[model samples]
Target: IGTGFPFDPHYVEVLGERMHYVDVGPRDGTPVLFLHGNPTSSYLWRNIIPHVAPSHRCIAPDLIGMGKSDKPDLDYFFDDHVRYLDAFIEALGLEEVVLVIHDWGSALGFHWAKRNPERVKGIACMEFIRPIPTWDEWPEFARETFQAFRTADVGRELIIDQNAFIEGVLPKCVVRPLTEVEMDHYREPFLKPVDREPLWRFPNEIPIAGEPANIVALVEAYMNWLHQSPVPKLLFWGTPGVLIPPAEAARLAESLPNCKTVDIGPGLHYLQEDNPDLIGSEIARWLPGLA
Candidate 1:
């Protein structure tokens, strides 16, 4: 499992937990922070990072409970993730960051940038967005999926007991199936039911019907910042993706200042797995233009 991961692991104490991350490329180079979402780790960027590392300093961290990072005893709610993310950036003494975010990473990264606007140089995002959209905003299939996850018994059984998110949802999200070796790395961190708490809790954090008001508010604040901020933003979306379909991606592009959207054809929600080459090179090309 470790052989596929090229970079040596590094750790820093963030809020009393050993936060695991991969720090590669020249130390004095411009910083590009890669953030992953639920049921995945910094490993999501394994292929993408190499392409960008030639000209940028790439930093990818396992969100507190999801990867090789320490899983402290907590509910792994939205705020918990935000706290760790904030501390991680501060601990690294990172400033003027170029952000690359996916899935839940979109929300966490956007919120972080909004709070520390001066620290961010640009953003390249995929898959998720801020201001946690209402049920009406989602497509039918996505709505149904969220509905199922919000259902207590079924959600827990699949995500916690069976670890079906990694087994079932993950495979479906990628255009190409994962290799056995790749699957092993994603599965290794959550072998126990208890270790899957973060997976189970992530879906519930979606602010349906105004539940999780704090997260809802945070997202709204970030959304406001996104629309007004002058930061350069590049958005990528793929066909056959349930989340952030082409129309929504275009609308987001229109709403934000100095933002551009690119369509990576024929990918699913986890576009990184299906189109890492495009994601990597496009971002690499876009970063220099931001200057």
Candidate 2:
């Protein structure tokens, strides 16, 4: 249905670009920063925001070039995105942050938490990027799809010209059938080919097969830090997932400290679309422990 964005849209200057975000709830409440990933905007958390906004200051931002935000000329690389998000957080002075992250959001939020452990109070993640898996980790079709999406000219064609993320990947990943209207919101920002460069770059940023050794090292480092942090960590996982499947979730739960894992029913890469209530209520139950 994709029709619930009741909050007012807010904008702030970050890296000279007009970064868009959804900010709601009491000023005195605990700050909960909801971070979305590739090809999605703050709109991704429309339903979940309502569940948390009453008790916490829910802030969800559109990553530069991906949502209502300005499409500035930039590489849209991993560090590039991190730079914009870092500035956005600082601009708001978000201290004692409780991060709700998914997909690429996991990498971004985890990287920030790793660098600023003193400021992060808690974290909730689902379908996040841990380490780029080997070819064997990907389904044969998925492996080729991602491989093509990351290719130079080929990727541009799939994402920019074909609108692959909005038309194909998103629909396939979401368990429920997406309405045309709902799909339109996801398609709005990147309607033009020019606006699709960020989508192309995101797949390429995958540290797959250790080709991009630096990024692999970065994820490895943050994961190491994340596993040890004393902060309360909540993991929402499900079956039919692209990233964090049930087996991997169990492995992750057993490996980490102070980490709680919940099964959010049938879900996939975009769990927010399918299990918003479960994710939100679980978060509602978990927030009490963060303090």
Candidate 3:
């Protein structure tokens, strides 16, 4: 699936940072932004973009310090990430946008929408984690994983590198397995230790069971966004997502008045890799007019 797709990559300046993104389709077309998660890049959206870009202006930017975005040795907290995304949106002047957010992108994109609710047209969420939310049914293992990263240095490294977390743990997070070439797509950004800093710190951004952590403000922002905005939303769940359990998706949908929910069969956290076609089809059917 990773092999034969055509896309032109480009860069846009956001707050003086060179943000790498893929912009395709009609300049005057409605806009859709595809935001990715940790351990992956804008490349994760490679297959899905072509399916929508021809008719919509699809933009997928690599988060700061991830993918192709500038990864300086500075603050890369959740709020910081959201601010950079806001700068990107302002630079591009995107309006009435259809936001497609997955994993960490949920926190990143949803926060952006909170601050600019008027600009968002719709949202399609996949395997998203709502940090401010508390779901009692979440598995102990799931809770442990979140706690582990917030507390353990070894756990932090696992998320960053050759440890089972990235090499093995990540694979298990998906239902349909990734091909070697497809796996390489996820691995391309962190080929060296220097590249792994953002990859590692990403997990540390989670505010697991406490206050005053760096991500608390951002988590509150997402919760506020969902509560305050009347924006239409869809929750697309990967049935087998390890990090974001299906129960959490259900909880969010049940509480959010404007949200419609679906559980797509068989996927990991990287649903874009496992079920890109299904995701693409859903977008094609549901996200018309907005982008």
What is the full ranking by TM-score, best candidate first?
2, 1, 3
In order of appearance, the predictions have TM-scores of: 0.95, 0.97, 0.87
Question: How does candidate 2 score on lDDT?
Answer: 0.86
Query: Residues 229-252, candidate 1, lDDT per residue (tens digit)?
Result: 999999999986766788778888
Location of the lowest summed lDDT over 10 successive residues in candidate 1: 129-138
lDDT value, residue 223 of candidate 2: 91
Where in model 1 is the C-alpha error above 4 Å? 1-3, 132-136
User: What residue pairs are clashing in model 1?
Assistant: none
What digit string (tens of lDDT, one per residue) describes model 2 on residues 1-291? 347577788999987899999988878767899999988988899988888987888899999898789999888888899999999999998777899998788899999989999998889999988776687887554678888897777888888899998898898888888888888889999878887888888888877888677789999999999777788889998786887778999998989889899998888789988988888888988888777
Total residue pair clashes for candidate 1: 0
Per-candidate clash tally: 0, 0, 3
lDDT for model 1: 0.86
Q: Which one wins on lDDT? A: 2
Candidate 3 stretches with Cα past 4 Å from truth are 132-147, 160-165, 211-214, 289-291
Most accurate candidate by TM-score? 2
